[PDB]
Design an enzyme around this catalytic site. Structure first.
Site, PDB file in Angstrom:
ATOM      1  N   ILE A  26     -12.675 -11.981 -14.421  1.00  0.00           N
ATOM      2  CA  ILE A  26     -11.855 -10.862 -13.981  1.00  0.00           C
ATOM      3  C   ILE A  26     -12.382  -9.537 -14.517  1.00  0.00           C
ATOM      4  O   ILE A  26     -12.445  -8.549 -13.784  1.00  0.00           O
ATOM      5  CB  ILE A  26     -10.385 -11.087 -14.392  1.00  0.00           C
ATOM      6  CG1 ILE A  26      -9.790 -12.256 -13.599  1.00  0.00           C
ATOM      7  CG2 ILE A  26      -9.573  -9.805 -14.222  1.00  0.00           C
ATOM      8  CD1 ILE A  26      -9.012 -11.837 -12.365  1.00  0.00           C
ATOM      9  N   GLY A  27     -12.772  -9.504 -15.788  1.00  0.00           N
ATOM     10  CA  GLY A  27     -13.287  -8.291 -16.383  1.00  0.00           C
ATOM     11  C   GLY A  27     -14.500  -8.579 -17.244  1.00  0.00           C
ATOM     12  O   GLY A  27     -14.725  -9.705 -17.694  1.00  0.00           O
ATOM     13  N   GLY A  29     -17.314  -6.371 -20.210  1.00  0.00           N
ATOM     14  CA  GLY A  29     -17.520  -5.203 -21.039  1.00  0.00           C
ATOM     15  C   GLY A  29     -18.097  -5.585 -22.388  1.00  0.00           C
ATOM     16  O   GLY A  29     -18.493  -6.727 -22.620  1.00  0.00           O
ATOM     17  N   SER A  30     -18.128  -4.586 -23.276  1.00  0.00           N
ATOM     18  CA  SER A  30     -18.685  -4.781 -24.610  1.00  0.00           C
ATOM     19  C   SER A  30     -17.871  -5.776 -25.428  1.00  0.00           C
ATOM     20  O   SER A  30     -18.433  -6.481 -26.276  1.00  0.00           O
ATOM     21  CB  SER A  30     -18.770  -3.442 -25.342  1.00  0.00           C
ATOM     22  N   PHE A  31     -16.557  -5.846 -25.198  1.00  0.00           N
ATOM     23  CA  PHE A  31     -15.721  -6.781 -25.946  1.00  0.00           C
ATOM     24  C   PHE A  31     -16.128  -8.225 -25.674  1.00  0.00           C
ATOM     25  O   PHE A  31     -16.103  -9.067 -26.579  1.00  0.00           O
ATOM     26  CB  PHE A  31     -14.247  -6.564 -25.598  1.00  0.00           C
ATOM     27  CG  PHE A  31     -13.925  -6.790 -24.143  1.00  0.00           C
ATOM     28  CD1 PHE A  31     -13.531  -8.040 -23.688  1.00  0.00           C
ATOM     29  CD2 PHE A  31     -14.021  -5.751 -23.231  1.00  0.00           C
ATOM     30  CE1 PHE A  31     -13.245  -8.250 -22.353  1.00  0.00           C
ATOM     31  CE2 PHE A  31     -13.732  -5.953 -21.895  1.00  0.00           C
ATOM     32  CZ  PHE A  31     -13.343  -7.205 -21.455  1.00  0.00           C
ATOM     33  N   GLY A  32     -16.501  -8.525 -24.446  1.00  0.00           N
ATOM     34  CA  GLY A  32     -16.812  -9.874 -24.042  1.00  0.00           C
ATOM     35  C   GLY A  32     -16.465 -10.063 -22.573  1.00  0.00           C
ATOM     36  O   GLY A  32     -16.736  -9.186 -21.745  1.00  0.00           O
ATOM     37  N   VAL A  34     -13.321 -11.597 -19.828  1.00  0.00           N
ATOM     38  CA  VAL A  34     -11.947 -12.023 -19.598  1.00  0.00           C
ATOM     39  C   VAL A  34     -11.930 -12.878 -18.339  1.00  0.00           C
ATOM     40  O   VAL A  34     -12.335 -12.421 -17.263  1.00  0.00           O
ATOM     41  CB  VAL A  34     -10.992 -10.826 -19.473  1.00  0.00           C
ATOM     42  CG1 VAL A  34      -9.657 -11.271 -18.911  1.00  0.00           C
ATOM     43  CG2 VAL A  34     -10.793 -10.172 -20.829  1.00  0.00           C
ATOM     44  N   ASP A 140      -4.805   0.932 -29.164  1.00  0.00           N
ATOM     45  CA  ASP A 140      -5.286   1.069 -27.790  1.00  0.00           C
ATOM     46  C   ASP A 140      -4.127   1.079 -26.800  1.00  0.00           C
ATOM     47  O   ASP A 140      -4.180   0.430 -25.748  1.00  0.00           O
ATOM     48  CB  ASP A 140      -6.294  -0.028 -27.439  1.00  0.00           C
ATOM     49  CG  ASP A 140      -7.125   0.317 -26.214  1.00  0.00           C
ATOM     50  OD1 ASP A 140      -7.160   1.506 -25.838  1.00  0.00           O
ATOM     51  OD2 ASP A 140      -7.753  -0.594 -25.633  1.00  0.00           O
TER      52      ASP A 140
HETATM   53  C1  D1E Z   1      -6.416 -11.454 -17.127  1.00  0.00           C
HETATM   54  C2  D1E Z   1      -6.180 -10.132 -17.879  1.00  0.00           C
HETATM   55  C3  D1E Z   1      -4.985  -9.227 -17.467  1.00  0.00           C
HETATM   56  C4  D1E Z   1      -5.456  -8.172 -18.491  1.00  0.00           C
HETATM   57  C5  D1E Z   1      -5.163  -6.833 -18.237  1.00  0.00           C
HETATM   58  C6  D1E Z   1      -5.534  -5.853 -19.124  1.00  0.00           C
HETATM   59  C7  D1E Z   1      -6.168  -6.160 -20.297  1.00  0.00           C
HETATM   60  C8  D1E Z   1      -6.482  -7.459 -20.633  1.00  0.00           C
HETATM   61  C9  D1E Z   1      -7.175  -7.787 -21.969  1.00  0.00           C
HETATM   62  C10 D1E Z   1      -6.538  -8.725 -22.779  1.00  0.00           C
HETATM   63  F1  D1E Z   1      -5.374  -9.317 -22.380  1.00  0.00           F
HETATM   64  C11 D1E Z   1      -7.067  -9.085 -24.002  1.00  0.00           C
HETATM   65  N1  D1E Z   1      -8.182  -8.539 -24.436  1.00  0.00           N
HETATM   66  C12 D1E Z   1      -8.819  -7.646 -23.707  1.00  0.00           C
HETATM   67  C13 D1E Z   1      -8.372  -7.226 -22.460  1.00  0.00           C
HETATM   68  O1  D1E Z   1      -9.155  -6.236 -21.818  1.00  0.00           O
HETATM   69  C14 D1E Z   1      -9.692  -6.473 -20.558  1.00  0.00           C
HETATM   70  C15 D1E Z   1      -6.094  -8.470 -19.722  1.00  0.00           C
HETATM   71  C16 D1E Z   1      -5.470  -9.430 -15.995  1.00  0.00           C
HETATM   72  C17 D1E Z   1      -4.255  -9.775 -15.086  1.00  0.00           C
HETATM   73  N2  D1E Z   1      -2.997 -10.136 -15.782  1.00  0.00           N
HETATM   74  C18 D1E Z   1      -3.026 -10.772 -17.123  1.00  0.00           C
HETATM   75  N3  D1E Z   1      -2.296 -11.701 -17.742  1.00  0.00           N
HETATM   76  N4  D1E Z   1      -2.824 -11.877 -19.029  1.00  0.00           N
HETATM   77  C19 D1E Z   1      -3.891 -11.048 -19.221  1.00  0.00           C
HETATM   78  C20 D1E Z   1      -4.045 -10.341 -18.026  1.00  0.00           C
HETATM   79  C21 D1E Z   1      -3.853  -8.705 -14.044  1.00  0.00           C
HETATM   80  F2  D1E Z   1      -3.050  -9.277 -13.117  1.00  0.00           F
HETATM   81  C22 D1E Z   1      -5.091  -8.128 -13.318  1.00  0.00           C
HETATM   82  C23 D1E Z   1      -5.878  -9.256 -12.653  1.00  0.00           C
HETATM   83  C24 D1E Z   1      -4.615  -7.160 -12.244  1.00  0.00           C
HETATM   84  C25 D1E Z   1      -5.961  -7.404 -14.341  1.00  0.00           C
HETATM   85  C26 D1E Z   1      -6.515  -8.405 -15.369  1.00  0.00           C
HETATM   86  O2  D1E Z   1      -7.253  -7.729 -16.322  1.00  0.00           O
END
Ligand code: D1E
Lengths: 341, 16
Positions: A26-27, A29-32, A34, A140
């Site tokens: 799904i995502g 970046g530098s963190f890793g 997702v 954050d």
């Molecule tokens: C799967 C991650 C989201 C999320 C959103 C924002 C930040 C994080 C995040 C984290 F949770 C932990 N660490 C780093 C992160 O940064 C990316 C995770 C996820 C869905 N929903 C979620 N349920 N649980 C976690 C998420 C949403 F529906 C989307 C598909 C529209 C967007 C999508 O990103």
């Protein structure tokens, strides 16, 4: 089907076999990375954050999330380790279909009804009161890290990858938070900041939801402060001293824009009053999250006959614990309405 | 600390 030996987020270290499937990136970046995936035994969607983990020390994000159990924080269901030859930590999180960032973006293309502004902000301050009670600063706070269940209007804070237990005397990096939501003392380069930076960021989110767009859309570090000054006016020398005492310089005197003229013509006065008490230059002058929950802007949420636009009852709003109330226990006189006792 | 303040003073006058 992928099967791993995973440890539950809560309770003692009792690893067990967990199988999941349908993994999609799904995502990135530098963190890793997702991932989204589905647990086989239950069919529930989950989110997986995969970060590289050194074997010589504990993952700071993991250790923080293991002490958290709150209705407005995303739950760590499991964590497990996986992989040339490097070892990755995987954090298995509850999957929530929506974020505040996406929902607000639709209105940025009109304004979110204020009943939802009350609902979402109230839960965000609850989550902040809970983590702050442990000494943990999220660092954050921004709409993208606010998960929403549109069916139930439940909000959940996530992404503890920037979080840290701030300890007095140990300096911290000043270049933290997303720019639009960065507290002014951070922009000034303060390294002794407190958890009140999260309250500033939460104030920016509230203002954004009232305005339909970010309130301080700076294009850079300095420009972020310029955007703040163009709304709040030039901070006084005492306010600058509270933020960072190392600025004896003299800055141009910009007048504060009238708060009631900042927002839309029918913005509730209680909402503008709350914003001004969150977006304070002096960090110690900001409301605490628990004080924010008890603000009059959220009085409608404590109404016994409150009606949500989805036709459902409100989520859990008054199930405060001792840990959540510890900063100011007498606020439960306001926070827990008589019908919740 | 001195470099940040100089740029800030500059940008504030353009809006002042
Ligand atoms: C799967 C991650 C989201 C999320 C959103 C924002 C930040 C994080 C995040 C984290 F949770 C932990 N660490 C780093 C992160 O940064 C990316 C995770 C996820 C869905 N929903 C979620 N349920 N649980 C976690 C998420 C949403 F529906 C989307 C598909 C529209 C967007 C999508 O990103």
């Amino acid at each position: 089907v992928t099967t791993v030996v995973a440890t539950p987020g809560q309770g003692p270290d009792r690893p067990q076999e967990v199988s999941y499937t349908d993994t999609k990136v799904i995502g990135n970046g530098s963190f890793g990375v997702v991932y989204q995936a589905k647990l086989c035994d239950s069919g529930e969607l989950v989110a997986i954050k995969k970060v590289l983990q050194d074997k010589r020390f504990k993952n700071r994000e993991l250790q923080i999330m293991r002490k958290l159990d709150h209705c407005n924080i995303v739950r760590l269901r499991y964590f497990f380790y996986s992989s040339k030859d490097e070892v990755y930590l995987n954090l298995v999180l509850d999957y929530v279909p929506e974020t505040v960032y996406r929902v607000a973006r639709h209105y940025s293309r009109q304004t979110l009804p204020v009943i939802y502004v009350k609902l979402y902000m109230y839960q965000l301050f609850r989550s902040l009161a809970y983590i702050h009670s442990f000494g943990i600063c999220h660092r954050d706070i921004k709409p993208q890290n606010l998960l929403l269940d549109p069916d139930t209007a439940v909000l959940k804070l996530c992404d503890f990858g920037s979080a840290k237990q701030l300890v007095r005397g140990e300096p911290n990096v000043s270049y933290i938070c997303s720019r639009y939501y960065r507290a002014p003392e951070l922009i000034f380069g303060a390294t002794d900041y407190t958890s009140s930076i999260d309250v500033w960021s939460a104030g920016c989110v509230l203002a954004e939801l009232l305005l339909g767009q970010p309130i301080f859309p700076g294009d850079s570090g300095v420009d972020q402060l310029v955007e703040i000054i163009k709304v709040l006016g030039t901070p006084t020398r005492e306010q600058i001293r509270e933020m960072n005492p190392n600025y004896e310089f003299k800055f141009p005197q910009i007048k504060a824009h009238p708060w009631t003229k900042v927002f839309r013509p029918r913005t509730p006065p209680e909402a503008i009053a709350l914003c001004s008490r969150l977006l304070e230059y002096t960090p110690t002058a900001r409301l605490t999250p628990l004080e924010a929950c008890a603000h009059s802007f959220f009085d409608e949420l404590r109404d016994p006959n409150v009606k949500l636009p989805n036709g459902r009852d409100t989520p859990a709003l008054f199930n405060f614990t001792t840990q959540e109330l510890s900063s100011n226990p007498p606020l439960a006189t306001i926070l827990i309405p008589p019908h919740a006792r | 600390p001195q470099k940040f303040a100089e740029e800030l003073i500059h940008r504030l006058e353009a809006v002042q």
